[PDB]
Design an enzyme around this catalytic site. Sequence first.
Site, PDB file in Angstrom:
ATOM      1  N   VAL A  20    -102.882  66.366 -24.628  1.00 37.08           N
ATOM      2  CA  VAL A  20    -101.646  66.858 -25.220  1.00 37.08           C
ATOM      3  C   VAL A  20    -100.501  66.567 -24.270  1.00 37.08           C
ATOM      4  O   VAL A  20    -100.677  66.612 -23.055  1.00 37.08           O
ATOM      5  CB  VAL A  20    -101.669  68.391 -25.444  1.00 37.08           C
ATOM      6  CG1 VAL A  20    -100.803  68.763 -26.636  1.00 37.08           C
ATOM      7  CG2 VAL A  20    -103.088  68.908 -25.646  1.00 37.08           C
ATOM      8  N   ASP A 133    -103.122  50.250 -25.115  1.00 34.88           N
ATOM      9  CA  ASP A 133    -102.535  51.114 -26.143  1.00 34.88           C
ATOM     10  C   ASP A 133    -101.077  50.775 -26.462  1.00 34.88           C
ATOM     11  O   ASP A 133    -100.243  51.676 -26.604  1.00 34.88           O
ATOM     12  CB  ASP A 133    -102.668  52.596 -25.737  1.00 34.88           C
ATOM     13  CG  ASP A 133    -102.641  53.558 -26.940  1.00 34.88           C
ATOM     14  OD1 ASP A 133    -102.453  53.109 -28.102  1.00 34.88           O
ATOM     15  OD2 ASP A 133    -102.823  54.782 -26.722  1.00 34.88           O
TER      16      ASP A 133
END
Length: 248
Positions: A20, A133
């Site tokens: 997160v 990514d």
Amino acid sequence: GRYLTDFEPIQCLGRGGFGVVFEAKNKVDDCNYAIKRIRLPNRELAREKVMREVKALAKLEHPGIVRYFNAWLEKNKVYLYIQMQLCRKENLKDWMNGRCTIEERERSVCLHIFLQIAEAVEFLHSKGLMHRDLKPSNIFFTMDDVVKVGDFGLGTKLYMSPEQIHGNSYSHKVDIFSLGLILFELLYPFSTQMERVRTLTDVRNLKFPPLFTQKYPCEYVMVQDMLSPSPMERPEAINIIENAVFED
Ligand SMILES: Nc1nccc2scc(-c3ccc4c(c3)CCN4C(=O)Cc3ccccc3)c12
């Protein structure tokens, strides 16, 4: 722990399977930061891997890599915190969404954006690292407008190379595939979300809108190369950076 004591949480910025990211204000310095919290593996060997990964990333300093501040551990099951410079709310995906006509996507601005991404990737490759990514929702802008390559190191597969999708062995060449699609996407704006996915999946399969190939002949050939099914054939990041399309 340190996070609750030394910071005031503002909001949640992102939630992957990894961890997160929170916007939080440090009470002592009054600046806002992006803070990623990661669940640490219980197993011994997997924990050592991650701790070595942190030590490698902390050494990284580059104009296209988000500025690092601190990393620490906290017990509950253990959590790893990484405090990074807070980038703008509007990422590259948002940037492209707000600019849906050709006039809004000026060649120079788009290439200057792509070049900064490509230079960040070249820097990582030269260090023996890959990004893995690269996608528009994970490409950021600093408050002073510098383009930053996003979270990496420790979602759609739309920008993901075929070998990386299939769980096959792979090299830094995976980032080049991602670069190709981003270059196309920067130069070719979309009316709707469905058009975006329809066209991008075709471009992955080397099928190009005829208006792109005619308007952008050089970068078409380039995108074509970067999108080889065979990773060996994709050019090195340095070759891309030194390409003639970035002359001026
Ligand atoms: N920095 C950010 N600003 C605004 C929104 C968001 S959403 C995710 C981030 C973000 C970006 C980059 C990175 C992170 C969150 C955590 C680690 N990191 C990296 O680039 C990896 C890294 C760690 C340490 C040193 C160098 C690089 C974000």
